[PDB]
Design a protein around this ligand. Structure first.
Ligand SMILES: [Cl-]
Ligand SMILES: [Cl-]
Ligand SMILES: [Cl-]
Lengths: 265, 264
């Protein structure tokens, strides 16, 4: 029996009222844990809830304050339940104070007419792209295999747009929470733009899972292509818009991020 | 004489909760209007005794379409930090939850600025005629929309809409108003399929990227909305949007996630 780190970080227990977990120090980022893991964690809670029906649709996580690397507690309410659809409200506490909050939508979906409006960019295969290793690694970075295509802080690239191949490392089958996490695996837009770091932190993170659950699972350990772009940077904040595609060209999820930023003049 | 929007979002604090009334003037055929609903949620947080700072972000989930009736809202300032604060809000009609939301307040400080995305080149409001829809919903009489691109009547082959928008009759722009304006877009799915289908918004998000001083300066003027979609599969599609001042200032961005009935 071997535990994958991810399943290890997001491991929870239910006492019948609240969920218990530990912030893993191995997922640390700066000034608190990697956002994607915290969000994946926020999602399992509702997923592991007994009342929970259907599969995930959307997730919005708001980081109220950087989580200590401590045990924490999550209280996940099945706030509304309808035929095909379900809404959750979640709260994570450490030492009696609110650390993180999230809302989620679960639902049972059936097949419809489908089309894909966005274009998948034309890119080389994971074969041709070399894995990218940062000179100063972040603890959680070790948990992902990223082949960077364009858009880094080392690039000559003058816009904010990033392309990357990414998967869990070591390889892990794909599911919803893992997928949420992969959406915070993007280098902060602002670094990409300035080629040097500034202090930043994420206030809020949203993710929509566009692909039906079956499609998502289909990927198994196959690598994925993320695309993160930025919109603007003003008066202390900026935003990240991003998409995640299957190697086949199927659009898996879309995400947005609102991020505090410290750059003065 | 008060303004309808201001009538719709008017709330009274009993010391614990907020009390307001869904108003039919704002009805949408399916249930009430998302934007008005969303606005009220934020109005709650701003109106809270404990509010600190100005709006940053808001996400709203519609658990169930609200009936036209009185409601209460529990707005909770879940954490209050030095420079930043977070709310969780719950609208309830008859003890069953209708709507929830999470808001972020905080302070905008002078800092570095660049804007990455390109505001499209479009005709000024003047040279675009106001588009009045053939079958209007009650909430529609409260907005003035000049439609440049992307309608269900258009010849367009994609999901992308450009338009000019402001409240009618005019009211000085504020955060709540701004939020509402983001639900103004014809659902992406009409635009592509060039025909109306059943839809609903499960979830909606507005980031406010312009500092408050910038938002307020807009005052009474028309804004450019820009809305697109990434994809449609298995009952849902999404909507991405941007809101620009005329000066080329980026004000907000939005995402919406939307139900659809579209069998093969
Ligand atoms: Cl964080
Ligand atoms: Cl609650
Ligand atoms: Cl957004």
């Amino acid at each position: 029996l071997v535990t994958h780190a991810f399943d290890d970080a997001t491991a929870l227990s239910f006492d019948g009222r609240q969920f218990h977990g530990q912030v893993k120090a191995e997922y640390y980022n700066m000034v608190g844990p990697f956002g994607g893991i915290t969000a994946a964690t926020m999602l399992k809670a509702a997923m592991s809830h007994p009342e929970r029906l259907g599969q995930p649709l959307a997730l919005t996580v708001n980081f109220a304050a950087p989580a200590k690397v401590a045990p924490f507690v999550i209280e996940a309410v099945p706030v509304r339940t309808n035929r095909s659809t379900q809404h959750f409200t979640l709260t994570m506490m450490q030492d009696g104070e609110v650390v993180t909050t999230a809302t989620a939508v679960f639902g049972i979906r059936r097949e419809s007419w489908s089309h894909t409006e966005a274009v998948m960019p034309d890119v080389p295969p994971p074969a041709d792209v070399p894995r990218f290793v940062a000179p100063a690694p972040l603890p959680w970075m070790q948990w992902y295999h990223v082949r960077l295509i364009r858009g880094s802080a080392f690039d000559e690239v003058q816009d904010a747009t990033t392309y990357q191949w990414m998967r869990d490392d070591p390889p892990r089958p794909l599911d919803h929470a893992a997928l949420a996490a992969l959406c915070d695996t993007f280098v902060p837009r602002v670094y990409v733009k300035l080629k040097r770091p500034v202090p930043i932190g994420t206030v809020t993170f949203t993710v929509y899972f566009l692909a039906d659950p079956e499609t998502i699972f289909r990927q198994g350990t196959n690598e994925l292509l993320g695309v993160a772009r930025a919109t603007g940077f003003s008066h202390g904040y900026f935003d990240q818009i991003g998409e995640v595609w299957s190697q086949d060209g199927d659009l898996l999820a879309t995400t947005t991020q609102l991020v505090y930023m410290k750059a003065p003049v």
